[PDB]
């Protein structure tokens, strides 16, 4: 029972029975009930003396204001109806002219106030692994689109170069390894909610080892024709999958020689092991990103967790 | 043509015609494609070098490595099959040399680095009823920071006894809700704003409004009190102006408040602004049980 309803019911009571009853109510119901207490006060002694319970009424009130310390407007004091079988009693009269005191003075003191809660900013988290001989620059056109879908977009660059600004993927530990140091840095000052990793060909592959061995917690996966060669050889960590329930969005097209193999091998334990996800063939696509790729990624975001 | 496609195409022209026939291809579709330029010229002369273009995959190598500073592998430099012609020249030797420098370098120099891209600020304000306070009317309101919202509970001056705060005089209310309001959009810049209310509280909620002293997305009340209704004929206008949404909901055994707020939305639906009126079965003059579902609906439907 909340204080208003307390409150509502008190009144009904006292329209629907009499002051007596709605008193006998208010005392039983009272208890406990958290709010504004010099406005249950007042209604208990307002109740008593309308009742006829004049000798209740003046210990109700003198606790309300000599022991509590609280106060009530003036003109309500010496008006309401309830209350006049009490002005009889000196003590009502010290109670008067106390709170007229505290009135007087509460009103000079008015003043605004207001009381802000700000919110904790659900954070989520995108990280996005270029693919080999790529960098930052080559891989965040294809997926700058995540913004749209409040997600701060991470992009890793693996350390193993190659060339002047091409970087690869092959030693897969230093990559599992420094995937986790991004991944630790940023949750450790911050600690958000969702958390959804993409990749493209050897980018997606290490996306996938670091997610099975467990070096990263996170909601759902995109695959961009990930290469995945030993498929078959993490059968075991693949249950990784189905334990902690992570959907997976995987596309690839159908003419890239290098990944529709793996690509395909892959989706093939995922349905094994039933874990939900969504494969999609495009046709006519070579190993390269679609056209309409940031689309895909709208129904992958709401695919991962948009819909649970 | 992005920088993949043209590398994709450009490696199927080698295969379907020939090395003469990818560089010619390169060539021509490489101008203004954006992406690692040295992947670009590596492509470029070791195709000038394969067809027997030397002489023009020597100048490719010089300006790729000499002008724009840039180092390929030492190993592939001296092992690839497509840039076996050009060991004759001694300017391949330098070009050698210089990237087996920049490449001991670069290699002792590996390290990770990663670029963060980040990603609103939203408020809303909800008013109490006369003789409530903020501890009273902040449980009812605390369920919007779920919608990432920012919840400010201002509390009027105007005192009637311990505790108790009311909206009588609708003027300084409104004043003090303009001040509340002011003072955060100046350290804010608040996206989305919905204010809320119950009873006066709504009706100083929407005066505020109607004299454009405060802007607002949508607005959400709770049995609101509005008993002059009619005289705001001409300032509720203003709702029809800048487009603005509400949620009203009202219990049907409230005595005090389910006739003003039947006769304001009647007013919302002849003036054609968007809302919707709820209505809660056996509900008095409090709010409803499940309350902070119908704050969803609210924040979904306004900010929809």
Not at 178 to 195: A, P, T
Not at 217 to 226: K, L, N, S, T
Not at 256 to 285: A, M, R, S
Request: net charge negative; proline share 2%.
């Amino acid at each position: 029972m909340t204080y208003i309803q307390l409150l509502n019911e008190t009144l009904h009571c006292y329209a629907s029975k009499g002051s007596l009853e709605a008193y006998t109510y208010i005392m039983e119901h009272a208890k406990g009930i958290v709010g504004n207490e010099a406005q249950i006060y007042n209604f208990k002694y307002a109740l008593a003396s309308a009742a006829g319970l004049e000798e209740e009424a003046m210990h109700v009130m003198k606790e309300a204001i000599i022991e509590k310390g609280f106060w009530y407007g003036n003109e309500y004091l010496i008006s309401d109806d309830d209350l006049k079988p009490l002005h009889k009693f000196e003590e009502f009269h010290q109670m008067v002219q106390l709170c007229k005191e505290r009135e007087e003075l509460a009103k000079k003191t008015e003043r605004a106030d207001v009381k802000y809660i700000d919110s904790k900013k659900k954070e989520k988290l995108f990280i996005a692994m270029h693919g080999d001989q790529e960098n930052i620059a080559i891989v965040e056109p294809y997926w700058k689109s995540v913004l749209d879908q409040d997600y701060t977009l991470a992009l890793p660059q693996s350390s193993q170069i190659q060339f002047s600004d091409g970087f690869v993927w092959d030693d897969i530990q230093r990559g599992k390894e420094e995937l986790k140091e991004h991944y630790v840095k940023f949750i450790e000052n911050h600690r958000g909610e969702s958390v959804i990793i993409g990749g493209f060909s050897a980018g997606a592959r290490v996306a996938l080892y670091t997610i099975l061995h467990k070096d990263i917690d996170v909601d759902g996966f995109i695959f961009m024709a990930p290469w995945l060669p030993e498929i078959d050889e993490w059968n075991e960590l693949l249950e990784v999958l189905q334990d902690k329930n992570i959907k997976g969005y995987v596309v690839c097209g159908d003419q890239d020689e290098d990944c529709f193999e793996c690509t395909q091998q892959f989706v093939q334990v995922l349905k094994d092991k039933n874990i939900e996800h969504e494969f999609k063939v495009v046709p006519n696509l070579k190993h390269d990103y679609p056209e309409d790729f940031d689309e895909l990624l709208k129904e992958a975001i709401k695919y991962i967790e948009d819909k649970s």
